[PDB]
Structures are given as C-alpha cells and as structure tokens.
Amino acid sequence: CAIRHPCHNNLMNQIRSQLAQLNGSANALFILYYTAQGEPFPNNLDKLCGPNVTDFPPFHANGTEKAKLVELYRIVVYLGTSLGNITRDQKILNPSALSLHSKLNATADILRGLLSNVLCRLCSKYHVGHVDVTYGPDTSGKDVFQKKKLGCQLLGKYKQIIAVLAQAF
Amino acid sequence: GLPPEKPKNLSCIVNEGKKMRCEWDGGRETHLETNFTLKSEWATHKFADCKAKRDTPTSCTVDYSTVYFVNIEVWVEAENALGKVTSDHINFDPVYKVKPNPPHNLSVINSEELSSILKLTWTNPSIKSVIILKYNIQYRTKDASTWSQIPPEDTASTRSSFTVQDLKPFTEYVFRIRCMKEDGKGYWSDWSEEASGITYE
DSSP states (O other): OOOSSOOOTTHHHHHHHHHHHHHHHHHHHHHHHHHHHOTTTTTTHHHHSOOOOSSOOOOOTTSOHHHHHHHHHHHHHHHHHHHHHHHHHHHHHOTTOHHHHHHHHHHHHHHHHHHHHHHHHHHHTTOOOOOOOOOOOOOSOSOHHHHHHHHHHHHHHHHHHHHHHHTOO | OOOOOOOEEEEEEEETTSOOEEEEEOOSOOSSOOEEEEEEEOSSOBOOOEEOOSSSTTEEEOSSOOOTTSOEEEEEEEEETTEEEEOOOEEEOGGGGEEOOOOEEEEEEOTTSSSSEEEEEEEOOGGGGTSOEEEEEEEEESSOSSOEEOOGGGGOSOOSEEEEESOOSSOEEEEEEEEEETTSOSOOOOOOOOEEEEOOO
16 A cells, blocks of 8 residues: 555546446457457357456456455456466467457556556555455466466456456446 | 856657657857757656767757657756766656647548548558547638648547538649647647549539
8 A cells, every 4th residue: 555646536437438448358368368268268269268257367347346346456466477477388289369468458557557556545545454366377278278277267267257346437 | 168057948759669758958159169068858867968969969869769658757967177067957747748640541532422522441550559649620612722620629529530611613622631648738740741632512
C-alpha cells in the first residue's frame, strides 16, 4: 500500500473500463494463440484449449466489493505472471507469430494498469494493508507440447473468467 | 549565466498506436548547458525518466507503452550549474489526450433512388474499441474553393456511415472526415482521403 501521490477518485469507473477492454479482445488473443500453434490445436480446441480452473484463483461474483477486488487482484497477478511465461515460450516456439507476441504484451500492459487501480481502491477505500500472493508455476515442467497446451488452456480460462469479471463490478 | 526558470505549458499527446509525447516551453535562455527531464508516474509506480535530446530540447517521447484508464502524473525538471527546478505537475488519464488515426476507406453511394441523397461509409480507426467517436464531415461541390461542414451535433457519436441530404441535383461532391474522442477531450485526427460522388436529378 505504498503510494507516490493521491490515488484517483474515479477508480471503480476506470477498472470497469479496464475489464471491458480486456473482455473485448480476449477472444482475439485466444484465436491468435491457437492459430499460431498450428495442428493439432485449431481442430481440437475442446481438449487442448478448454477453461481448466486448475489452481487458478477463485472468484465469487456474489461477494462484497472489497472481496471481489481482492479476488480480482490475485487473479490479475496470476494471469499477469502466466502471461509472461506464455510470451517467453511463444517468442521461442513461434518466433514468427509477430502479431501474437504483440497482443500478448498489449494484454500484459492493460493488466498491470488494472493491478495499480485495484490496489489503489483496495488501499484507499478498504485500508487492506496488503494482498496475499499466488503465482502461475510455468517451469520447464513440460515438453514443448505441454507448454503450448498449458498456454492454450490458460487463455481459454482467461476468456471465460474475464467475461464473468467484466460484468460483476 | 543564469539559473533555469520553471518550465511551463506542459502538455502531452498520444497519437493512436504510438508512445506518449509531452512538450513544454523552456523559458528565458540560460546561456548555460541546461538539461530537461520528463518525469512520469502512476500512483503505484515510478516510470523511467525521459531525458530530452539536444535536437528536440523541449519535448520527450517516453519509453513505456500507453495504458488507458490509469491516471499518470507528469512533470518537467530543468537543471544547470546554477539551479535545478521542476514544473507544476499535471495528472491525467491518457484517454483524454488521444489523436486517433483518420477514418479510412471513405466511399460514396446513391443508395436512395433519390437525387438530393448521398451516403458515406467508412471504417473507423482502431481506437474505437477504447473511445466513443465524434466527427467533422466536410463536403463541397467538385469545383468550389472552400468546404462546407455538416452540423457537429449530427455526427456526435460513433458510426460508420452518414447520409447527406438537401444537396443540389446532378452535382458532383467531394467528402472528407475526421474524428476524436466524443467528449472533445483530445486532438482531432488528420483528415481522411477524399471521396467523390454525383447525384440523380
């Protein structure tokens, strides 16, 4: 909760705009990703790119504002880190998917901004003290294929969860 | 020689697609070697300082990419052997400082079976997915020295087409259009490529 100057007074409206932004380009990010992987992903989306809530952080759209922002926070962090690994690998495995790399970063940038804003309402309105950590375990735990799949499943989960988040605030 | 004056008139612009750029008025010549530094920071993160080049001493294009909907505080620091001063700070959401790309693919059609009617269609710049658009639609006869404009209020929200009417029959017309954030906070885009069309009689 360290601040460098006064947080903005239209935070909730801004994160709403940020969630919409995410939600409105997630489908394109997903599509870009599998299309860039090639066979056998485009044809087997259901079993290679489904939305698996593995260790993925929870979200109770029915919670209080404070509780949702705290869950949203852990989610963004999780996505944010999952996104770094995905891009790290994708720049190696598919060095040619220029468009893909680009949209990955663009989404990573939007996500950081969301963290800032969420952290700001959480500190300014709820004096939370701080929020608890939860990262995505990228690791070398997987031959090229498991990376591609884990990646594709994350984005699959991302596309689904984001929509749920986008209209719960 | 003299110490640096407080820089002023700091203003930033974000051309669609590009990184932010701020400019400012340096002040009275110091006669000394004076360095300018553009500082910027979210409320939770200090960004990389931007040091103005000699070529362009009173302007800086940051190195981080533009993130909308997150207020960013910005200011300029001036310094030389005699003093180190900073400008007043400004704090804004980059969304209100955008200069979209011009709408493109403007084209004319007579899809009305009537004379005094022409319909324009175009493709909006990508920033449409972030901001609601406003437009200025200009038209004139093929052979006319100045442009005429359609009332601003009639083209005040995003759209990809407009049908111009009350035009003179059997006349050729030229068109151009530009856009910017719907609330007027930002910068007008450059004009689109012109498009022509004639009417029935």
